[PDB]
């Protein structure tokens, strides 16, 4: 078969690997997907960042992924706004402790404490909309 477009790192496998392509939904909106897969034995906390925070809905954008599990990130531009080839997305990932919390205040404290050399990052680029 065809190999899946997936970036592989030591914490997460990310699909697609580099280029984000947006499609049209039956509910009348543009939408792309970012699938994260935790390939470690511990919880991986992740955050999603973008160069155009005013343009895109990103859900989830500040959460965590259980070991062995996958998380789908739904990205959709707001109505009337167009996708730009300069729009980029940043995936920040860091491995959490064995008995670490995943609630809002625990995630805030984790990212305030984690040393920056243990934070893995991967960038994605948006492609212009085709229809």
């Amino acid at each position: 078969k065809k190999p899946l477009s997936v970036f592989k790192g030591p914490l997460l496998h990310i699909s697609p690997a580099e280029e984000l392509y947006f499609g049209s939904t039956e509910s009348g909106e543009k939408k792309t997907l970012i699938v994260l897969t935790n390939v470690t034995k511990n919880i991986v906390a992740f955050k999603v960042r973008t160069t155009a925070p005013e343009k895109y809905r990103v859900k989830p954008s500040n959460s965590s992924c259980d070991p062995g599990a996958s998380v789908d990130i739904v990205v959709s531009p707001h109505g009337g706004l167009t996708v730009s080839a300069q729009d980029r997305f940043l995936i920040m990932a860091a491995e959490m402790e064995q008995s670490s919390g995943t609630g809002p205040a625990e995630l805030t404290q984790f990212w305030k404490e984690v040393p920056r050399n243990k934070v893995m990052e991967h960038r994605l680029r948006c492609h212009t909309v085709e229809s």
Binding site: T51, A52, Y56, S61
Partner: peptide, 8 residues
């Protein structure tokens, strides 16, 4: 050019 926190 820099990155900003995404919004749900």
């Amino acid at each position: 050019d820099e990155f900003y926190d995404a919004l749900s």
